[PDB]
């Protein structure tokens, strides 16, 4: 359910990359979630859905956190 | 290897006019896609980055998808012959 999903997602490299990009753009705290309550916040911001919402549906790779700068890549 | 080399043509013996069945099949489809991991069992399966495999002990293995053409031909007594054929969809 939620526990195994939390472990698996926390262990993906993709989670680390998205979380550190969120930290750079100041959407998630630069602490690492100190108490489960902020961990839900970090999961929601990084992945885009609450873990229950992730389990509910079957399309997970898109709502991941996107950079809030939209840099001019030119 | 899968297509050219592994062609199977064997005959096995076990309505009393039927003496043997000749099994013939060959694969013409094989592709190896990148490693996948199923997130919460009921997921669509997602990309498996190498560090995830290293940390979880998973094997950095990509699934192999196969499709074959099968010919089941039964040879009866006194030389009567019947052929059953099926086009088998790409499985993995």
Residues in a beta bridge with B26: B69
d(CA B17, CA A36): 73
| Torsion B43-B44-B47-B50 (CA) sign | positive
d(CA B37, CA B59): 10
Q: At what angle do helices A13-24 and A2-11 cross, to 10 degrees?
A: 70
Q: Could you identify the residue written with the tokens 């002990």?
A: B57
A14 touches chain B (CB under 8 A): yes
Encoded tokens for A42: 């970090």
Q: Name the nearest CA neighbour of A44 among A53, A35, A31.
A: A53
The CA-CA-CA angle for residues A49, B48, A7, to 5°, reads 50
d(CA A6, CA A42): 11
Q: How many residues does chain A have?
A: 74
Report the residue of chain B nearest A12, measured CA to CA: B52
Instruction: Please answer yes or no on whether A11 and B39 come within 8 Å at the CB atom.
Output: no
d(CA B64, CA B66): 7
Instruction: Please answer yes or no on whether A12 and B44 come within 8 Å at the CB atom.
Output: no
d(CA B61, CA B34): 7
A30 touches chain B (CB under 8 A): no
Indicate the resolution in Å: 3.0
Instruction: Please answer yes or no on whether A59 and B44 come within 8 Å at the CB atom.
Output: yes
- What string of DSSP letters covers B58-71? ------EEEEEEEE
d(CA A43, CA A63): 12
B39 touches chain A (CB under 8 A): yes
Asked if A22 and A46 count as a contact pair (C-beta separation under 8 A), the reply is yes
B58 touches chain A (CB under 8 A): no
């Amino acid at each position: 359910d939620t526990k195994v999903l939390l472990t698996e997602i926390l262990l993906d490299p993709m989670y680390d990359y998205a979380a550190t990009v969120a930290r750079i753009d100041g959407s998630i705290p630069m602490h690492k979630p100190r108490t489960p309550k902020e961990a839900e916040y970090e999961f929601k911001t990084v992945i885009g859905r609450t873990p229950a919402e992730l389990l509910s549906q079957k399309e997970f790779y898109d709502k991941i956190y996107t950079s809030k700068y939209r840099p001019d890549f030119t | 290897i899968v297509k050219q080399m592994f062609n199977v043509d064997i005959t096995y013996k076990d309505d009393k006019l039927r003496e043997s069945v000749q099994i013939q099949f060959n694969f013409t489809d094989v592709n190896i896609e990148r490693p996948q991991h199923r997130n919460y069992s009921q997921g669509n399966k997602i990309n498996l980055l190498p560090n995830k495999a290293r940390l979880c002990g998973l094997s950095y293995s990509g699934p192999v998808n196969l499709a074959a053409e099968v010919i089941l031909t039964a040879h009866y007594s006194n030389g009567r012959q019947e052929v059953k054929r099926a086009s088998i969809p790409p499985f993995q």
